[PDB]
């Protein structure tokens, strides 16, 4: 019903999801009473394989992960999908024998939904984890802004630009590829806008710091002013980063 979060997800689910609906509407206008429904055992023979292989892979994946939200969330989706296949398989059993079976109609129709739903749940949970990785980079950068306050030496500044430069760069790559990955356009701009504002400010922050350093080591006036514009740059920078963090978490 709602649009898919990511194109990758959507690629996997749009073609299928659609098919169900035709089936949902289509059953209401029964096309049997003569046409009947063929034997789809073969079709179900494979799904039941692909599904046990999703649980193996998913199962492999849960072990090989530091993430804990994924660990708890992911398992329910295995069984949702694995349970759902069973319904399909019975339905195909029922139809070997009574192509006209009414509950097998529903058994086709609910089982297929279950596979879709549960597979969506895997993809969203795995994604939710990708976003968290990005978020972490974000949060860590944020911390690195807080320490801009304590820099008072060109020697210190150089490490700090050397440290913080490639944090910034990583973050850039991540969000540029994440904005490409998402279906909604409104959210896309929110990221690109927000992240362009940041990329601009990095040089400004470096500058505003060099000005601070010099006045601190210059025994002169307007020391406060250089400080103000410093803090401001960091404030504004953080505002944008926390926005990126927040927009990354929108599904609505």
């Amino acid at each position: 019903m709602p649009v898919f979060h990511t194109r990758t997800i959507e690629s996997i689910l749009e073609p299928v999801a659609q098919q169900i609906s035709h089936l949902v509407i289509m059953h209401e206008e029964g096309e049997v009473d003569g046409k009947a429904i063929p034997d789809l055992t073969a079709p179900v023979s494979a799904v039941q394989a692909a599904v046990s292989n999703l649980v193996r892979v998913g199962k492999e994946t849960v072990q090989t992960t530091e993430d804990q939200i994924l660990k708890r969330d992911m398992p329910p989706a295995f069984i949702k999908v694995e349970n759902a296949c069973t319904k399909l398989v019975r339905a195909a059993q029922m139809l070997q024998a009574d192509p006209y079976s009414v509950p097998a109609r529903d058994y086709l129709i609910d089982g297929s939904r279950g596979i879709l739903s549960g597979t969506s749940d895997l993809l969203l949970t795995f994604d939710e984890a990708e976003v968290r990785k990005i978020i972490r980079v974000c949060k860590g950068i944020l911390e690195y802004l807080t320490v801009a306050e304590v820099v008072e030496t060109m020697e210190d500044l150089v490490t700090y630009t050397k440290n913080l430069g490639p944090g910034m760069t990583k973050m850039a790559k991540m969000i540029d590829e994440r904005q490409q990955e998402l279906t909604h356009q409104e959210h896309r701009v929110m990221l690109v806008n927000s992240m362009n504002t940041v990329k601009e400010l990095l040089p400004v922050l470096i500058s505003a710091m060099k000005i601070f350093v010099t006045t601190k080591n210059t025994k002169s006036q307007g020391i406060e002013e250089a400080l103000k514009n410093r803090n401001f740059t960091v404030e504004k920078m953080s505002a944008e980063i926390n926005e990126i963090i927040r927009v990354l978490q929108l599904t609505s």
Binding site: I12, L13, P15, V16, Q19, I20, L23, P38, L40, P43, V44, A46, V47, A49, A50, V51, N53, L54, R56, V57, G58, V81, L88, S112, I115, L116, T119, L122, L123, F126
Partner: peptide, 16 residues
């Protein structure tokens, strides 16, 4: 994550 594509395909194919 593409086992999920495999699944999505067998089910798709089944709908006939």
């Amino acid at each position: 994550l593409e086992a999920a594509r495999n699944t999505t395909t067998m089910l798709s194919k089944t709908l006939s």
